Enzyme design. Structure first.
Site, PDB file in Angstrom:
ATOM      1  N   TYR A  23       9.532   5.111  12.974  1.00  0.00           N
ATOM      2  CA  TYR A  23       8.423   4.239  12.572  1.00  0.00           C
ATOM      3  C   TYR A  23       8.868   2.897  11.986  1.00  0.00           C
ATOM      4  O   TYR A  23       9.980   2.779  11.472  1.00  0.00           O
ATOM      5  CB  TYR A  23       7.472   4.990  11.594  1.00  0.00           C
ATOM      6  CG  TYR A  23       8.184   5.882  10.594  1.00  0.00           C
ATOM      7  CD1 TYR A  23       8.626   5.383   9.374  1.00  0.00           C
ATOM      8  CD2 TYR A  23       8.456   7.217  10.889  1.00  0.00           C
ATOM      9  CE1 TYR A  23       9.332   6.184   8.477  1.00  0.00           C
ATOM     10  CE2 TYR A  23       9.166   8.024  10.002  1.00  0.00           C
ATOM     11  CZ  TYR A  23       9.584   7.509   8.788  1.00  0.00           C
ATOM     12  OH  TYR A  23      10.262   8.311   7.908  1.00  0.00           O
ATOM     13  N   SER A  41       5.543  12.187   7.062  1.00  0.00           N
ATOM     14  CA  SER A  41       6.210  13.444   7.396  1.00  0.00           C
ATOM     15  C   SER A  41       6.245  14.327   6.151  1.00  0.00           C
ATOM     16  O   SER A  41       6.577  13.841   5.068  1.00  0.00           O
ATOM     17  CB  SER A  41       7.628  13.169   7.892  1.00  0.00           C
ATOM     18  OG  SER A  41       7.691  12.128   8.856  1.00  0.00           O
TER      19      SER A  41
HETATM   20  C1  LIG Z   1       4.947   9.934  12.062  1.00  0.00           C
HETATM   21  C2  LIG Z   1       5.187   8.999  10.908  1.00  0.00           C
HETATM   22  C3  LIG Z   1       5.798   9.514   9.760  1.00  0.00           C
HETATM   23  C4  LIG Z   1       6.004   8.689   8.655  1.00  0.00           C
HETATM   24  N1  LIG Z   1       6.716   9.183   7.576  1.00  0.00           N
HETATM   25  C5  LIG Z   1       6.889   8.403   6.450  1.00  0.00           C
HETATM   26  C6  LIG Z   1       7.505   8.947   5.333  1.00  0.00           C
HETATM   27  O1  LIG Z   1       7.879  10.113   5.359  1.00  0.00           O
HETATM   28  N2  LIG Z   1       7.699   8.185   4.193  1.00  0.00           N
HETATM   29  C7  LIG Z   1       7.332   6.839   4.195  1.00  0.00           C
HETATM   30  O2  LIG Z   1       7.496   6.141   3.180  1.00  0.00           O
HETATM   31  N3  LIG Z   1       6.743   6.278   5.332  1.00  0.00           N
HETATM   32  C8  LIG Z   1       6.474   7.055   6.451  1.00  0.00           C
HETATM   33  N4  LIG Z   1       5.814   6.525   7.559  1.00  0.00           N
HETATM   34  C9  LIG Z   1       5.382   5.084   7.584  1.00  0.00           C
HETATM   35  C10 LIG Z   1       4.020   5.002   6.920  1.00  0.00           C
HETATM   36  O3  LIG Z   1       2.998   5.509   7.764  1.00  0.00           O
HETATM   37  C11 LIG Z   1       3.774   3.587   6.382  1.00  0.00           C
HETATM   38  O4  LIG Z   1       3.723   2.653   7.443  1.00  0.00           O
HETATM   39  C12 LIG Z   1       4.673   3.083   5.254  1.00  0.00           C
HETATM   40  O5  LIG Z   1       4.744   4.021   4.202  1.00  0.00           O
HETATM   41  C13 LIG Z   1       4.079   1.809   4.688  1.00  0.00           C
HETATM   42  O6  LIG Z   1       2.704   2.013   4.525  1.00  0.00           O
HETATM   43  P1  LIG Z   1       1.829   0.792   4.002  1.00  0.00           P
HETATM   44  O7  LIG Z   1       0.382   1.176   3.902  1.00  0.00           O
HETATM   45  O8  LIG Z   1       2.347   0.292   2.706  1.00  0.00           O
HETATM   46  O9  LIG Z   1       2.051  -0.341   5.110  1.00  0.00           O
HETATM   47  P2  LIG Z   1       1.063  -1.592   5.361  1.00  0.00           P
HETATM   48  O10 LIG Z   1       0.340  -2.025   4.103  1.00  0.00           O
HETATM   49  O11 LIG Z   1       0.121  -1.230   6.490  1.00  0.00           O
HETATM   50  O12 LIG Z   1       2.127  -2.716   5.824  1.00  0.00           O
HETATM   51  C14 LIG Z   1       2.732  -3.564   4.862  1.00  0.00           C
HETATM   52  C15 LIG Z   1       3.302  -4.850   5.475  1.00  0.00           C
HETATM   53  O13 LIG Z   1       2.479  -5.285   6.551  1.00  0.00           O
HETATM   54  C16 LIG Z   1       1.955  -6.583   6.302  1.00  0.00           C
HETATM   55  N5  LIG Z   1       0.507  -6.667   6.610  1.00  0.00           N
HETATM   56  C17 LIG Z   1      -0.242  -5.732   7.282  1.00  0.00           C
HETATM   57  N6  LIG Z   1      -1.529  -6.150   7.336  1.00  0.00           N
HETATM   58  C18 LIG Z   1      -1.628  -7.341   6.697  1.00  0.00           C
HETATM   59  C19 LIG Z   1      -2.701  -8.209   6.461  1.00  0.00           C
HETATM   60  N7  LIG Z   1      -3.918  -7.911   6.914  1.00  0.00           N
HETATM   61  N8  LIG Z   1      -2.483  -9.393   5.761  1.00  0.00           N
HETATM   62  C20 LIG Z   1      -1.216  -9.712   5.299  1.00  0.00           C
HETATM   63  N9  LIG Z   1      -0.155  -8.851   5.538  1.00  0.00           N
HETATM   64  C21 LIG Z   1      -0.349  -7.680   6.224  1.00  0.00           C
HETATM   65  C22 LIG Z   1       2.222  -6.911   4.835  1.00  0.00           C
HETATM   66  O14 LIG Z   1       2.578  -8.276   4.703  1.00  0.00           O
HETATM   67  C23 LIG Z   1       3.360  -5.980   4.446  1.00  0.00           C
HETATM   68  O15 LIG Z   1       4.627  -6.607   4.442  1.00  0.00           O
HETATM   69  C24 LIG Z   1       5.594   7.331   8.679  1.00  0.00           C
HETATM   70  C25 LIG Z   1       4.958   6.820   9.820  1.00  0.00           C
HETATM   71  C26 LIG Z   1       4.788   7.641  10.946  1.00  0.00           C
HETATM   72  C27 LIG Z   1       4.090   7.071  12.146  1.00  0.00           C
END
Ligand SMILES: Cc1cc2nc3c(=O)[nH]c(=O)nc-3n(C[C@H](O)[C@H](O)[C@H](O)COP(=O)(O)OP(=O)(O)OC[C@H]3O[C@@H](n4cnc5c(N)ncnc54)[C@H](O)[C@@H]3O)c2cc1C
Length: 287
Positions: free
Chosen positions: A286, A77
């Protein structure tokens, strides 16, 4: 519509050919004694991403997956208004919580100024601002959920607009675990003192605050203190409720709304369906 959708732009940049912006700022906004860490970062857009208040952007994090392919886009966002944090319409800001074992969240917080960031979108239709400058905008956020509401309020109070002179009621409910987790507390305080009649502010700090009954001050608990007032506000045609943040927050809020609606004989599930179709109840939560 009742919203601000006047020739809106959605998906100008796809994940195949994303806009390659660059990091200008990246500050940890949370305290050192905060449960986790949320970072406010500003990227250059050079006015290429025509985003609006409420919209989100995609971030394709630098790296490869388990099967040798580029990473999937993660939505965020937009924390900044249309004209942005510098008031030049050449920037974009985010509010990113660092998640353990997270690729995108960690990449963004670890971003060094000058390092390029792959941006996609803009994405979003739901969380747009209402066209009415006299409308009663009720914003319910938790943690990173503040991002669209900061965007919203910057346009409302920190910006000069002939097309949009806000004189309604902006009510913000921000739920965080600790005081060190309060995001943009300063900006919202400046706002309440600048516009005392137009801006209402309430913080729900679950780990520090408690109510009359001695229950942890979550967003819904803070809302309950104005439950009678809010219910009567929701009944109005110019009332616009916005909910953003973590997935779990929806259950708590509907729980307290279920009791209110019951008192009048209305089923809150069929009532929030009516409001949602009327654009008056907007949600973006989310995992
Ligand atoms: C409309 C919308 C708005 C958003 N706004 C914000 C915002 O303003 N600020 C914000 O911080 N976030 C926001 N988010 C959430 C954002 O999109 C992320 O999901 C969040 O920041 C974490 O991203 P990430 O890549 O670190 O998560 P990921 O790396 O995809 O997930 C991390 C977790 O998933 C597990 N995992 C996933 N795949 C594996 C794998 N293959 N092997 C082992 N473990 C795995 C890990 O163990 C870990 O604990 C928003 C989401 C939406 C849909």
């Amino acid at each position: 519509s009742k919203k601000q959708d006047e020739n809106i732009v959605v998906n100008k940049f796809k994940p195949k050919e994303p806009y390659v912006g660059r990091c200008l700022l990246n500050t940890k906004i949370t305290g050192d004694d905060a449960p986790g860490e949320t970072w406010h970062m500003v990227f250059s857009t050079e006015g290429e991403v025509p985003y609006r208040e409420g919209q989100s952007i995609g971030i394709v994090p630098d790296g490869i997956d388990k099967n040798g392919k580029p990473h999937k886009l993660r939505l965020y966002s937009i924390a900044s208004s249309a004209i942005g944090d510098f008031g030049d319409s050449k920037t974009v800001s985010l509010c990113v919580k660092r998640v353990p074992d997270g690729v995108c969240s960690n990449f963004l917080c670890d971003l060094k100024p000058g390092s390029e960031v792959k941006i996609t979108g803009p994405v979003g239709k739901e969380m747009l601002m209402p066209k009415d400058p006299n409308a009663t905008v009720i914003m319910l956020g938790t943690g990173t959920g503040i991002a669209p509401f900061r965007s919203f309020l910057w346009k409302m109070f920190f910006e000069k607009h002939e097309d949009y002179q806000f004189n309604g009621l902006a009510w913000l409910f921000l739920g965080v675990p600790t005081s060190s987790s309060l995001l943009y507390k300063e900006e919202f305080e400046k706002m309440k003192e600048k516009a005392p009649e137009n801006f209402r502010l309430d913080f729900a700090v679950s780990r520090e605050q408690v109510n009359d009954k001695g229950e942890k001050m979550y967003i819904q608990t803070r809302m309950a203190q104005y439950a009678e007032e809010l219910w009567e506000l929701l009944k109005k045609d110019n009332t616009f409720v916005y909910m953003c943040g973590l997935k779990g927050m929806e259950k708590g809020i509907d729980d307290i709304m279920v009791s209110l609606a019951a008192k009048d004989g209305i089923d809150w599930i069929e009532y929030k369906r009516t409001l949602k179709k009327a654009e008056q109840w907007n949600v973006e939560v989310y995992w």
